[PDB]
Every structure is written in C-alpha cells, then in structure tokens.
Amino acid sequence: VTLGVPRLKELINISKKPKTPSLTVFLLGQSARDAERA
Amino acid sequence: XXXXXXXXXXXXXXXXXXXXXXXXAQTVNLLAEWLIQTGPVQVQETVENHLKSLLIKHFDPRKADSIFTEEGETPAWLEQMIAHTTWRDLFYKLAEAHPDCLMLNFTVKLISDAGYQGEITSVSTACQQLEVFSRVLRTSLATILDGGEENLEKNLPEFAKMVCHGEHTYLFAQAMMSVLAQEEQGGSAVRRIAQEVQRFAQEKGHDASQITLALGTAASYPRACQALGAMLSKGALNPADITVLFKMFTSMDPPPVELIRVPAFLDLFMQSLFKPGARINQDHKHKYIHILAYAASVVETWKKNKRVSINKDELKSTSKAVETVHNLCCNENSELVAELSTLYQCIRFPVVAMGVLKWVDWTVSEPRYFQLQTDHTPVHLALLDEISTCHQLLHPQVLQLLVKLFETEHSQLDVMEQLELKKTLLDRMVHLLSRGYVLPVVSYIRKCLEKLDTDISLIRYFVTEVLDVIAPPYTSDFVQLFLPILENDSIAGTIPVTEFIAHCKSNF
Amino acid sequence: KAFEKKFRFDYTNERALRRTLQEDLVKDVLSNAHIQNELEREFERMREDREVLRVIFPTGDSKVVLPCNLLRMIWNAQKIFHINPRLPSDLHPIKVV
Amino acid sequence: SNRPVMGIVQDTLTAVRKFTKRDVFLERGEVMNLLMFLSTWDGKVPQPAILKPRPLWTGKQIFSLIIPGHINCIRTHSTHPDDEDSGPYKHISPGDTKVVVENGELIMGILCKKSLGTSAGSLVHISYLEMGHDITRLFYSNIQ
Amino acid sequence: XXXXXXXXXXXXXXXXXXXXXXXXXXXXXXXXXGVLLPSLQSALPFLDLHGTPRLEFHQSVFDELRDKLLERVSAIASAEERYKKLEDLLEKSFSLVKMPSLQPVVMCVMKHLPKVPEKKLKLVMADKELYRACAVEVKRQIWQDNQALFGDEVSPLLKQYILE
Amino acid sequence: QGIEQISKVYMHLPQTDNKKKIIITEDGEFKALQEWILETDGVSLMRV
Amino acid sequence: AGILFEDIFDVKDIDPEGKKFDRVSRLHCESESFKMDLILDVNIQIYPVDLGDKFRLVIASTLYEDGTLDDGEYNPTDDRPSRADQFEYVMYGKVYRIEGDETSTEAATRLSAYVSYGGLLMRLQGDANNLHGFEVDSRVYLLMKKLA
Amino acid sequence: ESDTGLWLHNKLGATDELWAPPSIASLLTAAVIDNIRLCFHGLSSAVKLKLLLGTLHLPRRTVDEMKGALMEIIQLASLDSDPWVLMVADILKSFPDTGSLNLELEEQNPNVQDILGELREKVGECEASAMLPLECQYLNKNALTTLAGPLTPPVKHFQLKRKPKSATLRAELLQKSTETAQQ
C-alpha cells in the first residue's frame, strides 16, 4: 500500500504504472456475509 | 344524562338547546356491519381502543373519588368494565399515570381479587397494597416454578425488578421465600429463585445482605453472623472475619454449614482467590483454603433439630486441590502444561472447577491474550472442555463464557485469525453440546443465524461438526430447534446432511 | 422516533407548552390552526431535508464544515441577553419559522 | 485547514497549564505584578476568589482577565477521563479537566494545547472568529 | 336531511316526544338511541362527571370511522370480489343521498367499474341537482349517458376559442 | 482460473466505517454491517 | 438581607477519588436538617477541614448586611460592615449551572446549583424550595464557619 | 431535634425512592429513636417503612444496647392502619431478641395464609428437576446427595456415534503433559 509522498506523486502525475495498484471488491448477497462464498 | 337534565328543568332556553342537541349511533352500526361484510373483531377492537383513548385523554383526578364518596358499590360500570380484557388495561394505565388515587386503587384491588392479573406495571399497580402485591407475586413465582430454567433465564429480569421495586416488596418476597424454603420437598427451587432475586438486588446497587443473613436462620451465633454481614456488605474478603470464622469452625463444636454455604460469599471468595491479579498472604492462605474446603466438603446429617455426623475426610483432598490450583493461579508464567494432569484431577471437584472457570474467564477475557497465543487452540479452552466433561452444573457458565468470547470483536487479530478463533470457540460449543447441554447451544446458534450478523461459514461449520458426531434417534425438541438452521437457504445449498434431512422428513 | 420527538413541535400538550412558552403565545399556538399547519409544514420540510441529508451522506457522519457556528451563536445570544432557561420564553414559534 | 496556525508555545503553554490548575493561588502583590503585563486591562482589580482568611486570587481569574470580550468556548483537557462526561460530576469536574469559558471568563478547566493550541475550535480560534484579528493579537501577547 | 331508517327513527322519536307528558319516554328514547355490547353505558358516568358532551363523542367516532378506514375502503376497491363488495357498499349508501355522503360517495366511486344504470340514472339526476363531488366517475357517466358532457366540452371549446 | 494481471487477492472485514456497508434500518437508524470485501494486487475493473 | 442560602453541613468525605490537587480538597457534605447534598472545593492549606467537621454554610448575594449591591471589584479599604467578619472562610464566585429533575410537563422538585469560585467548584443538590435564590450567571459569596 | 418528625420527613420522606439509604446507620442514633418512640404517630407511611427497614441495617451492638425502644417502635407499628406497616411490624417483632426476623406467620392476616397454603401445596406436589440452588454448584457429590438428593441425569437428545474431536484434543494434550512431566 503506497502512501505519503510516493503515492501523492503517483496521483499528481497520471502514472500508467502505479507502485501498488489495487481493487476494492465489494460482494453482493450471501457472499458478503459468508466467508466460504467470499 | 340528557334525560336527567330534561327532568331537572321540565332556564328553559338552555334546557331546550340541550334537548335539541341530544335529539340531534345506528349509522355507526351500519358502517360496522358494512365493514364486517367487506372485511369483524378488528372493527370492535379499534372502536374500543378509540373509546379508551377518549377516556384516558382528558383527566380523572377526583371525579371517581366523588362517585366513591357514597362508597361506590355500583356494579353497572364495574362488572361491565371488569372482564372485557381491555378496560382493566385502561385502569392500569390510569393508575400508573395518577398514583395514590383511592378509586383507582379500589379498582386495582377489585381486578386483583378476581385473579385477573398479568400486567406487571411495577411502579404503581403492582406494589401499592399488600393483597395486590401478594397475589401478583404468587402468580409470578408460580410461573417461575412451572416454567423451569428457560423461564428462569427469560423471566428473572422483569420479575426481580418488580419484587425489588421497594425494600418492603423485597422483604415480603424474601419472607415468602424463607417460609417456603423450609419445606421438606421443593425447597431447593425456592432457595434458588430467592438467590437470583438476592443477586439481582445486589447488582441493582441495593444492600440485601442483611435480609439474607436475618431470614435464613444464620443469626444463631451473633459473632459469626456479624462477621459474615461485614463480609457481604463490604464486598471484599477481610482477614479479621476469615480468622474469626476459621477459629470458630476449627472449634470443638462446629456451627451449622448453612451460612458458610451462601452463594454470594462463595462468589466473593472466587473473586478474592482465583483472580490472577491477587496476592493472598501466606498467613491467611491456608485459612482461606480450609474455609473453602469446610464450606464445600462436609457431609452433615440432620434430623429436624440438630446434627450428629459431620465428615471431614474429603476436606483434606479438597484443600489440597484448591491449594494446588491457587498455586497455579499465583504462578502465572509456560509451566502450566508441565503438570496439567494434576490440574485435571483437581478440576474433578466442582468448587475447584468453578474456580478454574472463573480464572479462565479472567485470563481469556483480558485483551491481548489470543494475540499472544501461538498454538491453534488455547490451553484454557481445553480447561473449559474438561470442566464441561467433569461436571454438568457448570454448563450454563461455560456457555455464558463461550458466547461472551464469541460475541467479542478482536480487532488486534487478523481476519482469518479471528475466524479460526471463532471456530475454536465453536468447537468448545460443539463439545458442550456433546456433553448433554444441547438445547441452549442450538438456541444460541438460531439466535446467531437470523437476528445476528455472524458469519454464515461459522454456522455451516457448526452444522458440519454437529452432524459428524450425532446419530439417530433424535427427540422432537432437538429436531425442531436444529431443522430451521439447516433450511435457511444460506446453509443447505452449500453444505452427511442428506441422511439427517431424510430422517427428519420421515420421522418428524 | 427520536427525530420526531426532538424536531416536531408539539402544539397539543398544553401544560408542556405553558412550561416552555408564555400564556399569550400558548393561547395563540393552541387556538390558531394556521400556525399549527405552518409548524407541521416546517417539520415536513425538515423531514425532506433529513432524506436529502441521508442521500448526501450515506455514512452517518454528521461532522460537516459550515460557515456560521450556529450553536456558539445561540450560546452567545443566551449570554448577551441573559436568557433564563428555567423560565417560559416570549418567542413565538411562528416568528422562528 | 480552517484553524489557527499560531498557538501558545512551549514555556507559555507549560506554565499556563500549571497556571490554570485548581490549586493555584496568588497573593495581592503577585496579582498586581501580573496585571502590569495586561495590555487590555481596564484598571479594576477583580474581587478575589478567596477573601478570608487571606485575600487570594486564583489563576483562572487572571486568565479570565486575559480572555477577551465575551467569547464562549467548551474544550477538554488532555488528561480528561472518558467516563467523566457520562457518570456523575460531569459539570463539576474532580480533575478540573473540562474547560468552560462563559462570557469571556474561565469558569473551570486546565488549559493546554487542546484549548490554546492550533487546533480548530480552540480558544484562540473562537477569539479570532468572534473578536477579530487585533483583539486576538492582543490576546496572544497578553497570554505570553 | 337524510331519511331512510335513521330518518324514520328520528320521525318516530319526534312523534313520541310530542308533548303529552311521558318523562320516562324521553329517557327510553335516549337510551334506545350506545351502539352494541353495552359497555358504553359503563363508560357514560366516566364522561358525565365533567359537563357531559355526547355530540363530541358521536362526531369523534363518526370522524374516525370514516377517515381512518376510507383508506381500507380504497384498498378493497383496488377483482370480482372487490367489485361485488363495492357494489354492495354503493347499494347500502344509495339510501343516504340526502345524508352527508362524502365517504359514501367515495366508496361507490372507488368501485365504479360496474355502472349499475338502474340506480345510475337516479345517481346522475341527484348529482346534477346537488352538484356532487364525483369528478371522474360522474364525468364518465355524463359522457356515456347524454350530451351533458357534450355541453361541458362545448363550453370549454368556446373558452379555448375566446382565449385564442 | 481467475483474471490476468490480478496476482494476489486478500479478503478482510473492514474496521473503520469507511468501507463497512452502512444501511438505514426500519426505524431510520444508521447501522454498520460488517461484510467481506476483497482487496487485490493488480487491477482490471471491467472484468471484475 | 442578601442571603440566598442558609444551612449547616457535616463533612462526610474528603477527596474520595483521591488528593488530586495538593492545596485544594473536595468536600462531600450533607446537611443535618434537609436533604441537601453539598460538594465543595476549599483551600485546605489556609483553611484545614477534617472529616466529620460541622460548619455553617451561607450563600449570599452581597457581604453587606444592608443588602446593597456589590460591584465585584476588590476594595480592601471599604469600611462598611460586612458578613465576612462573622465567618472565617469567605469565597466569591458565580453560579454557572442550575439543573434539576424537571420534565416537559412538571416542574423541578430537586434542584442543583453549580457555583465556580474562580475555578474552585461547588455543587449544591437538594430540594428546589431552598435553592430558588440561585439564578444563573449571578455573583454570589460563600460564607463558612466551623462549629462545635 | 426540636421537630423530629419533620427531620425524618426531610431525611426519609422522598416517596420516589423506597430502599433505605446507606446513611440510615448514621441517621438512626439512640436519641432520635427516643424521640420517634414518642412521635411515631405523626409520621407518614413511606417514612414509616423507611424507618422500619432501616432498623435492620443497624449494627448488632446498637440493636442490643437499646432494644426496648425498638420493641416500642414495633408494637406501635402493629397498631397502624397500613397493611405494609402491619406486615413489617409482624415480621420485625422477633428481630431484637435473637437476631432473626419472624417466620411463624400462622395466626395473622388470613389472605396471605390462604395464598401461602394454596401455593405451598403446588410446591410440595409439583417440582421439575428441583431447580438446584447456586450453592449446590460448589458442592461435591456426597454433599449434594445428602443436601438435595441424587442428581438427575441430563435428558438424552441424540445417540452419540463417537466422541468429538475435543476428546482427541484432550488425549493429545495429556500426551504432551506426559512428556513434559518427566522434564
């Protein structure tokens, strides 16, 4: 998880390759409450 | 009363006006029957509710007293409004809104004299007269005797709140308990319900130690009674009173064991001794252990006035067990698994098992404990398993600790670490289910399924662990309590279970 | 129910009104149907504002950044004009609206 | 960040925490010496918090003389217990850890960087928002 | 001045209380006039002890039984069973044309799928004579029956021409 | 199995209410539901 | 004249939570005649109070017996007679909070007056009949004298 | 006290609170009960109940030194019209003689007598699992059998096909303890 000055730099210029690209996936239905379906 | 106004006039102008006003019901009946055809009970219930709101809304401070100035026999609005199940609710609400009313208290006494209680309303209606409170209290402990342990756990809050509304109410309740507890049969139930009422009064901030020392025939010896009263009132174990009781109990003539077997004193002793952050001095440590061994070891034969036999053979073994476990509790740091077999033989005594249970509660409920545990299952959970194995009376305490740990959110652990911790606690729950304490555990899993936001994978793991150890036949209650969690559309599809659902379909 | 209890004016409880307002204001609030209708309209607009707020802030985070600190200004008005909280006030709620 | 950038700094902050404790008592000569350094003083020596057996002012009275105008501020000392605001003695603080300023005077409370620092809602922030910049400059100088 | 059974009972009471003494007769008429399950007589002295309003109670129960469940009337109006219930309610409320029939007219308007022209002609005549509040159903019946809706549209056409 | 340029996926329950599922209950109260979320290494929105 | 409160209190506890100011101790006192709880901070360094001490507590709007107004300004050369000559612990402060058990419909039966004596706080809980003399943000004088 | 009745009304006449305050030990000195042995008639009902229940919280030496005045309080409380005061006097009339409250309530107040009889017949006739008291959890098996009787076995709900994994865990940690014991 990039934070602070390097993450700020990667946001101020439009970096095509960020250091730590990530997705925050949210689940629907029973899978959000079931660990096995998750 | 328009006819009365007509007869009391026949100025004429106001009389004629009132007459025309009265001459200005059946349309309401036509609307009611049209609605009954279009719809029955709901229409009349709503009409009676609107009538009750209109009767309640304005006031009634003294008019009922004015009509009761002639002593108010008047069965016309008494018998018509005494047994329709809704007007007595209005009278309870009016008595709650306006206390110390003579006519309202008369109507409360009338509705109590017909045996038509069933509303608590502990502020005004329940505790105003001796008769009404006596009858509602009799109904209350009749219900708590008929229901059982489930009704105990579901009904001591409101009932113990109603009987602890005043010190006089608590005194009357404890008087009835003390009278009923000396019966040859069924006195243990009365002593139990009195003990939960007493502990509710203790946790409500009111001192109830004086009542339970005076009414429980423990005032035969004033010195020991005073020492025990100071013990229970101060809420801590003092050296002076334990030395007094130890020197009295080692004398040639032993006192009765009843006052030393008070559960409040024994619980406070558990607080004093088995707390991890407790350093009992050695000059009174053996006195403490001997007091506990005498309180939980002696076998006393009683024939209606006195005793002739007291056994102290188990006292030595009990004192050795409590001394070893107290040494373990003062040891803290490993050195627990090194001689754990001896710990399990000391857990074979029930008082030592409850002490170990309280010590496990204090050791485990302390934060940053599982964060410092490296093994997959903690050793204290295995101590809980052995406690459940050796004794069945401690099963509600085990389940209480287990649900306390299961509901606890450990933000200092990883999410998978939290999940496997919940799985470990649930394995202890499965062991408790396998050791005969079945129905409350399945009830708790039912509570966790729909009205709690616990993980569905945990419920599935519980079902998998239970169905891998249980075999047919099954009773009706267990099937009725375990089938809905296996048909919840978040369990059955993912989760053998086919044999269980086939047996439940074929048999129930 | 808490929002209803805290923000809807109760022009029905006469003794509560007399404990909070002066006599002529209580008589005007009880008698006038137009005043009661406009107080109800004020509460309805507050309910619509509540729905707009819960659209704007899906998380229940009420700490916002706004120009005039209204609570401190009300406290300043209480201290400047020597407002006694134990006494009924002479402020008509329709004047507030 | 809609907050002051200038607060009360090391020596002044450490001493004003020690100045506004409950046990701080000043004799007449010390009070008259301290009033020489108030630029905004109106020339009236206030009535002491203790008249008998000795005429004895507290530090809260002197800082109340420092506090400009009639600003109203509620703050919280750093050592304030979390259960104090919920249990008894919430409006009469045993540890003097709830700062209350009413009508520009310090009713109780020990001042720190939570009340005199750069944080938003502090006493200097309320002083700037209510009294302007010149009065707040005088406030800073008089505190120091 | 709604007649019907209630109007007949009022006329009978007026004929009975037409002088000739009979002080007990007035009391009997007042007691006979209390809807069902006579606990209202039990509730009577609770209300008699502070300057008894009976008109207030009667208007309150009429207002609640109309306004609170006119929504229920619309819900049962909102297929065959609901239409039959609306027709039965309209047949019951047709006798109260002179009586105030805001709710009685709304009950027929909600279930206005069946026209029922045998009573519909009398209803249209009464609406034309008394300017009834049936807007949609009344306008549809006027358009389907005769040229009264034609005259109403001719007046709006003349108004539109004047506006143009 | 899976999607290209999605190397490692972690699952965790959120602690702060920024990522918790906030709902308005039947009595108009905000409730924070703790639900599972997935955090990946590597990105592809449109397939995920 | 000018007296807002008049009672005699017995010291029950001195700093039950702990001695957390070296010169000021919190006294928890109860009236001998009324349901009137008193919490009071005093400077024990100049006015030592022991547990179980009995004192007469007077809350006055002014020190002068003729009831004239006090400017709140220190005048050590004032030659007028004052109530302070009959007491040995005199404090000056303003009441900052008055709360009670009033409801929306009912008035308050048990009042509670909060007075700050330059940071030395005092709370006076009791029945509302004895505490009608307190009005918020008014300057009062505390007058104390130990009895036997 | 010049007016002891007003003093007791101030201290204990709060009808909103019904338990005895913890300060009743200091409130109930010898001189004040010497006064209320004369001014008991003019007291209200709530302060009467508060006084009669605060007599219990007094220490034993105070009860023993001045027992005759307490006897007069109880016998004066046995003449009042309040059923609560009458009941409390009937149960406290054996208190400052041996130290225990009265329990032989078999010759007064017939209503509670018939209620007690019709409920004690159900207590004697009906009992399910005996509702073992909190003291019995600490007791051993022999003490429980001599006190409450033989323990009722738990009801069977299913046939255990095999012991669960907790038994295996217990066995393997005893195996670990077996190695660590000889260390």
Q: Residue holding tokens 């599922």? A: F21
Please tell me the distance from the alpha carbon of residue H159 to that of residue B384, in angstroms, as a whole number. Answer: 23
Complete edge-to-edge strand list for the sheet that includes strand F9-12? A24-26, F37-40, F9-12
Q: What is the DSSP string of E29-44?
A: HHHH---SSS-HHHHH
Structural domains of chain G in order of their starting residue, each with its CATH number: 5-148 (2.40.50.140)
CB-nearest to C79 from D2, D72, D129 is D72
Tell me the pairing of strands G36-43 and F37-40: unpaired
Kindly give the residue spans of alpha helices, DSSP state H, lying in H13-82: 24-27, 30-36, 45-54, 60-65, 67-77
Q: Residue holding tokens 């750069």? A: D118
Please tell me the distance from the alpha carbon of residue H111 to that of residue B200, in angstroms, as a whole number. Answer: 28
Residues of E with Cβ-Cβ distance to B7 under 8 angstroms: 23, 27
Partner-chain contact G98 C82, CB within 8 Å:
no
Please tell me the distance from the alpha carbon of residue B416 to that of residue B412, in angstroms, as a whole number. Answer: 12
Judged by a CB distance cut-off of 8 A, whether residue B100 touches chain F is no
E and G make contact (3+ CB pairs below 8 Å): no
Residues of B with Cβ-Cβ distance to F12 under 8 angstroms: 414-415
Q: Is residue D83 part of a domain?
A: yes
Burial label for C83, CB within 10 Å (0-12, 13-18, 19+), is: middle
Choosing among C6, C21, C86, which should be mutated to test the G contact, i.e. which has the most G CBs within 10 A?
A: C86
Angle at which helices B239-249 and B222-234 pack, to 10 degrees? Answer: 150
Q: Is residue D96 part of a domain?
A: yes
- As a 3-state breakdown, chain C gives helix, strand, coil percent values, each rounded to 5, of 65, 0, 35
Q: Which chains touch H (3 or more CB pairs under 8 A)?
A: B, G
CB-nearest to E49 from B30, B66, B84 is B66
Q: Is residue D1 part of a domain?
A: no
Domain count, chain D: 1
Q: Residue holding tokens 């129960």? A: E61
Q: How far does the CA of residue B13 sit from the closest CA of chain E (Å)?
A: 17
Which helix H or strand E contains D75, and what residues bound it?
A: strand D73-76
Judged by a CB distance cut-off of 8 A, whether residue D112 touches chain C is no
> Whose CA is closest to B214, among H23, H57, H76?
H57
- The answer to whether A37 and B494 are in contact (CB under 8 A) is yes
Chain centre to alpha carbon of residue B370: 31
> Whose CA is closest to D70, among B449, C75, B219, B246?
C75
Partner-chain contact F18 C59, CB within 8 Å:
yes
- Cα–Cα distance list, E61 to A17, E28, E66, E129 (Å): 75, 23, 8, 30
CATH number at residue D35: 1.10.274.100
Q: How far does the CA of residue H151 sit from the closest CA of chain G (Å)?
A: 49
Strand partners, F23: F31
Judged by a CB distance cut-off of 8 A, whether residue C3 touches chain F is yes
DSSP state of C24: H
Partner-chain contact B434 H160, CB within 8 Å:
yes
For residue C76, what is the nearest residue in chain D, using CA coordinates?
D72
Please tell me the distance from the alpha carbon of residue E3 to that of residue E96, in angstroms, as a whole number. Answer: 7
Angle at which helices H67-77 and H83-92 pack, to 10 degrees? Answer: 150
Judged by a CB distance cut-off of 8 A, whether residue A29 touches chain B is no
Which helix H or strand E contains B466, and what residues bound it?
A: helix B456-467
- The answer to whether B122 and B161 are in contact (CB under 8 A) is yes
Partner-chain contact C16 G137, CB within 8 Å:
no
E96-100: long-range contacts (C-beta < 8 A, 24 or more apart)?
A: E96/E2, E96/E4, E97/E2, E97/E123, E97/E126, E98/E1, E98/E2, E98/E3, E98/E7, E99/B27, E99/E2, E99/E4, E99/E6, E100/E2
CB-nearest to E89 from B34, B54, B76 is B34
Instruction: Label each residue of chain G as H, E or C.
Output: CCEEEEEEEEEEEECCCCCCCCCEEEEEEEECCCCEEEEEEEECCCCCCCCCCEEEEEEECCCCCCCCCCCCECCCCCCCCCHHHHCCEEEEEEEEEEEECCCCCCCCCEEEEEEEECCEEEEEEEECCCCCCCCCCEEEEEEEEECC
Q: Is residue D77 part of a domain?
A: yes
Q: Dihedral through CA A24, CA A26, CA A32, CA A37, nearest 10?
A: -70
DSSP state of B357: H
Partner-chain contact F34 B415, CB within 8 Å:
no
Please tell me the distance from the alpha carbon of residue B418 to that of residue B410, in angstroms, as a whole number. Answer: 7
- Cα–Cα distance list, G148 to E115, G9, G29, H30 (Å): 100, 12, 16, 20
CB-nearest to C58 from F22, F27, F28 is F22
Q: Which domain holds residue D114?
A: 10-144
Judged by a CB distance cut-off of 8 A, whether residue D50 touches chain G is yes
Choosing among D1, D72, D100, D126, which should be mutated to test the C contact, i.e. which has the most C CBs within 10 A?
A: D72
Please tell me the distance from the alpha carbon of residue B298 to that of residue B290, in angstroms, as a whole number. Answer: 11
Q: Which chains touch A (3 or more CB pairs under 8 A)?
A: B, F
B384 Cβ neighbours under 8 A, 6+ residues apart: B357, B360, B398, B401, B402, B428
Partner-chain contact F11 B411, CB within 8 Å:
no
> Whose CA is closest to B121, among B98, B142, B95, B103?
B95
Please tell me the distance from the alpha carbon of residue C93 to that of residue B127, in angstroms, as a whole number. Answer: 43
Residues of C with Cβ-Cβ distance to F18 under 8 angstroms: 59
Tell me the two tokens of residue G136.
């918020």
Tell me the pairing of strands G89-100 and G54-60: unpaired
Partner-chain contact C76 D126, CB within 8 Å:
no
- The answer to whether G42 and G27 are in contact (CB under 8 A) is yes
Q: Is residue D4 part of a domain?
A: no
Please tell me the distance from the alpha carbon of residue F44 to that of residue A22, in angstroms, as a whole number. Answer: 9
H24 Cβ neighbours under 8 A, 6+ residues apart: H12, H50, H54, H57, H58
Amino acid symbol at G25: S
- The answer to whether H55 and H92 are in contact (CB under 8 A) is yes
Judged by a CB distance cut-off of 8 A, whether residue G136 touches chain C is yes
Q: What is the DSSP string of C25-56?
A: HHHHHHH-HHHHHHHHHHHHHHHHHHHHHHHH
Tell me the two tokens of residue B19.
């007459």
